[PDB]
């Protein structure tokens, strides 16, 4: 009984966080080799944020307008450029703590750890999933912008950088090439996240993990078609299932005896009846932030 | 509002692998000592009725196999402090942080760095349950995994020893004293009835008010004695006058007295949540201490 939600160990990311200051604005940066990456809105005042002209603002800056601090060691900015929505500050010293790393763009439903930082100091770490509406439910107070998301495989894969907090409380950001996830923009305009839906393929991998661990109370004798299940799932604000999800679940339906569409019939019955005070793997709710990959490679 | 763990970088550098004969588990490498569960000197057939003090006489320095990644460490002496083995090695750990051994109390929170054969694999935040167990994720190979808080100073407070059949885990402080009535033997051991940490639930409801989620608030107040009557009916740790004092800063920031907030909680247990959520949860969280709420919010 128990499958807790673990984050990756953060040490390899900790020695890459720095502080970047421009004018009166200070946020977090990421120091890899001889480049500091950070959100480009660092060059904005609060006046500029309603309608920022980022090209106009950056042509007016010099290298000495950017103060970068790795603890007490000041770094000298030696050049700068803009890639999409991320600023890249070239510095005179390479980070001796640079891990083996990669940049990846993720899709909704994938999970990663976040190292939440304030003024270049790490303060905490948590595991989350990219929601289907391309937002993340996290705990980011003011000054966490530029905090990064990663997976570790010795090879650190950076997939996310925090830019913006949305009025509904959720957070929005880019990949490390500076491209926003979702329809969002780095302006203070009214930006509406879509409906957040449950990640169906993730609930199903978790229920497969349940039968392997020993829980079976939720199984039924029924099976369903993909089209019929998706018609019911819509009504509960669940993401529709595709044929690609079915094949990703296949080794789990091999370790167990339960066909995917059979599992889908049981999920349909949980949605309609509830839990009745019971639990599945110690949880009183249907969990959707465990991906098939994580489950397959931990059973 | 998420359950955040402390950054693990300063502890990662202290984890090593200890092998004695056929058993491999995790150790903690501080200055020139390796700390690990003393049951690493036992075979699977020695766990019935181990005589640790006679089994340790058998062994010599060369029976212990200590590994810090690729580097290999040499045991030059060994010793027992209660339930923890202390192996003296030949080289100091140059990554030793500023640290301290503390024993904590039930209801308090800390982070755990889960490890397998000396390699860190994950980190999570948990609370010591009132029955002295932790609900965690350790599989075989994670004995000697350590729990900590960060204040520049790392306070180490826990070391995993055993997994109980109900999926809960049990351990010692770094001085080898068990949390709870367990022994380091392979035998039937049961964890007591777990209770809900009421002061942590209160801290979390204060957090929900800070986030503007204020619907469970009512006009009523109760008394300490009346609340505990309802508390232990529903299996809630009794509330003490010191508990009221700890919640003081959250009572000033919000403007809602502890006994006032207690009347909310008392109504949430009897009447349920009326099919509504607090902080997106239909479930009352008890693994955020008061001081976590101050840390994460103000």
Swiss-Prot record, chain A:
Cytoplasmic side: 1-299
Cross-link (Glycyl lysine isopeptide (Lys-Gly) (interchain with G-Cter in ubiquitin)): 5, 90
Any coiled-coil regions, as ranges: none
Residues spanning the signal sequence: none
Reported effect, residue 188 to A: Does not affect ability to cleave and inactivate human TRMT1
Reaction(s) catalysed by this chain's protein: TSAVLQ-|-SGFRK-NH2 and SGVTFQ-|-GKFKK the two peptides corresponding to the two self-cleavage sites of the SARS 3C-like proteinase are the two most reactive peptide substrates. The enzyme exhibits a strong preference for substrates containing Gln at P1 position and Leu at P2 position
Impact after mutating residue 132 to H: In strain: Omicron/BA.1, Omicron/BA.2, Omicron/BA.2.12.1, Omicron/BA.2.75, Omicron/BA.4, Omicron/BA.5, Omicron/BQ.1.1, Omicron/XBB.1.5, Omicron/EG.5.1
Domain Peptidase C30: 1-299
Regulation: Inhibited by pyridone-containing alpha-ketoamides compounds 13a and 13b. In turn, alpha-ketoamide 13b (tert-butyl (1-((S)-1-(((S)-4-(benzylamino)-3,4-dioxo-1-((S)-2-oxopyrrolidin-3-yl)butan-2-yl)amino)-3-cyclopropyl-1-oxopropan-2-yl)-2-oxo-1,2-dihydropyridin-3-yl)carbamate) inhibits SARS-CoV-2 replication in human lung cells. Inhibited ex vivo by michael acceptor inhibitor N3. Inhibited ex vivo by compound 11a and 11b.
Organism superkingdom: Viruses
Reported impact of residue 204 to V: In strain: Zeta/P.2
Annotated compartments: Host cytoplasm; Host Golgi apparatus; Host nucleus
Catalytic residue list: 41 (for 3cl-pro activity), 145 (for 3cl-pro activity)
Purpose: Cleaves the C-terminus of replicase polyprotein at 11 sites. Recognizes substrates containing the core sequence [ILMVF]-Q-|-[SGACN]. Cleaves and inactivates human TRMT1, preventing tRNA guanine(26)-dimethylation of tRNAs. May cleave human NLRP1 in lung epithelial cells, thereby activating the NLRP1 inflammasome pathway. May cleave human GSDMD, triggering alternative GSDME-mediated epithelial cell death upon activation of the NLRP1 inflammasome, which may enhance the release interleukins 1B, 6, 16 and 18. Also able to bind an ADP-ribose-1''-phosphate (ADRP).
Assembly and interaction partners: 3CL-PRO exists as monomer and homodimer. Only the homodimer shows catalytic activity. Interacts with host FBXO22; this interaction promotes the proteasomal degradation of nsp5.
Protein's name according to its UniProt entry: 3C-like proteinase nsp5
Organism: Severe acute respiratory syndrome coronavirus 2 (2019-nCoV)
């Amino acid at each position: 009984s128990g499958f807790r939600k673990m984050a990756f160990p953060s040490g390899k990311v900790e020695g890459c966080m720095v502080q970047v200051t421009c004018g009166t604005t200070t946020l977090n940066g990421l120091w890899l080799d001889d480049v500091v990456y950070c959100p480009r809105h660092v060059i904005c005042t609060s006046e500029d944020m309603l309608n920022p002209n980022y090209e106009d603002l950056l042509i007016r800056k010099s290298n000495h307008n950017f103060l970068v601090q790795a603890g007490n060691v000041q770094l000298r900015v030696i050049g700068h450029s803009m890639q999409n929505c991320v600023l890249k500050l070239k510095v005179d010293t390479a980070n001796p703590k640079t891990p083996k790393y990669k940049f990846v763009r993720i899709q909704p439903g994938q999970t990663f750890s976040v190292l939440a930082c304030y003024n270049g100091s790490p303060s905490g770490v948590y595991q989350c999933a990219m929601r289907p509406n391309f937002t993340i439910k996290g705990s980011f107070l003011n000054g966490s912008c530029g905090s990064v998301g990663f997976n570790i495989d010795d090879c650190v894969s950076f997939c996310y950088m925090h830019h913006m907090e949305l009025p509904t409380g959720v957070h929005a950001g880019t990949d490390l090439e500076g491209n926003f996830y979702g329809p969002f923009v780095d302006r203070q305009t009214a930006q509406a996240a879509g409906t957040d839906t449950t990640i169906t393929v993730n609930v199903l991998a978790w229920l497969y993990a349940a039968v392997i661990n020993g829980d079976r109370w939720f199984l039924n004798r029924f099976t369903t078609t993909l089209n019929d299940f998706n018609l019911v799932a819509m009504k509960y604000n669940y993401e529709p299932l595709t044929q690609d999800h079915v094949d990703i679940l296949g080794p789990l339906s091999a370790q167990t005896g339960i066909a995917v569409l059979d599992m889908c019939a049981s999920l349909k019955e949980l949605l309609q009846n509830g839990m009745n005070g019971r639990t599945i793997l110690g949880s009183a709710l249907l969990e959707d932030e465990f991906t098939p990959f994580d489950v397959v490679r931990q059973c």
